[PDB]
Amino acid sequence: DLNDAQLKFANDVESRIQRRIEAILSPIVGNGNVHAQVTAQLDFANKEQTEEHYSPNGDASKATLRSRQLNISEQVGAGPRSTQRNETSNYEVDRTIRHTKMNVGDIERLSVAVVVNYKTLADGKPLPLTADQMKQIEDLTREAMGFSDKRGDTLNVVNSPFSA
Amino acid sequence: DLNDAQLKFANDVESRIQRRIEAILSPIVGNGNVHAQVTAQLDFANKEQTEEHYSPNGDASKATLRSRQLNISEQVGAGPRSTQRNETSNYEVDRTIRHTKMNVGDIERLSVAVVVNYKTLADGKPLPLTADQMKQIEDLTREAMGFSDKRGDTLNVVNSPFSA
C-alpha cells in the first residue's frame, strides 16, 4: 500500500537524476555512448523536533537584569576587619524556540554508476578516452547528481567499450 | 495476510535492485552475459522513539542564569579568620526534543550474488576476463546495489563460463 507509493517515489527520483546526468553527458560523449543508473536511499521516517536555546549571561557586560540588591558592609576596627557582601540578581535571558517538522521523502545517500563508451574513429578503432575527459565527466556527473559529502554520496564512472 | 504483502514488497525491492545492476552490467559485458540475484533483509518492526538532549552548563561561560544569590562574609581577626560564601544559582538550559517514527519496510542488510560469463572471440575460445574488468564490475555492482558498511552489505562477483 504505502510501501508501493514510497517505492514509486524512489523510482521517479532515480529516473529523473538519471535523465539529468544523461542530458549533459549526451552532447559531448554522444547519444548512446553513455549509460547511467541511480539508486537512492530515502527518508520515510516522520520526525518532529523542538529546539530551545538560551544565550549565556555569565559575563556582566551582556547580562540583562530586572532587579538587583547589593548589601555591602565594611566594619574596620588587617586587624579586626569585617567585610560582608550580600548580592541578589534576577536576570532576563534571550530565548529562541524552533519547531521543525522534517519532510517525508528526503534523500539520505545517493550513489550513482555511470559507464561511457570508447571512441571509434573513421577507421573504426575503439580509441579510449583521456584522463582530462574522464575528469570532466566525473565533475559533470557530480554536478548533475547534486554530489555532497555530508550525505555520503559515492560516484563511480568507468570507461569501457560497449558490446554489440 | 500481512506476511504475504511484506513478502511481495521484499520481492519487488529485490527485483528492482537486480534490474538496476543488470542495466549497467549489460552495455559492457553484453546481453545475457551477466546474471544477478538479490536478497533483502527488511525491517517490518514498528518503532517509535523520543529523544531528549540537554546542553551541558557546568562551565560558567556557557551557563544561562535566571537568579543568583551570592552571600560573602570575611571576618578577619592566618589568625582567627572566618570566610563564608553561600551561593545559590538557578539555571535555564537548552532543550531539544526529537520524536521519530521509523518507516516500516526499510532495508537492514543487502547481499547480492552476481555471475558473469567468459569472452568468446571470433574463433570461439572462452577467454576469461581480466582483474581490472572484474574490479570495474565489482565497483559498478556496489554502486548499483547501494553498498554500505553500516548495514553490513556483502557482494560476491565471480567469473565462470555459462552452460549451454
Binding site: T50, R95, I97, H99 | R95, I97
Partner: peptide, 19 residues
C-alpha cells in the same frame, strides 16, 4: 514536552500580538 514547547512558542506569539 514537544507539545509543551509548541504551547510555549504559541504563548510567545500571543505576547507578540498583544504588544
Amino acid at each position: 514536552a514537544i507539545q509543551g514547547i509548541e504551547g510555549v512558542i504559541s504563548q510567545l506569539q500571543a505576547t507578540a500580538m498583544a504588544a
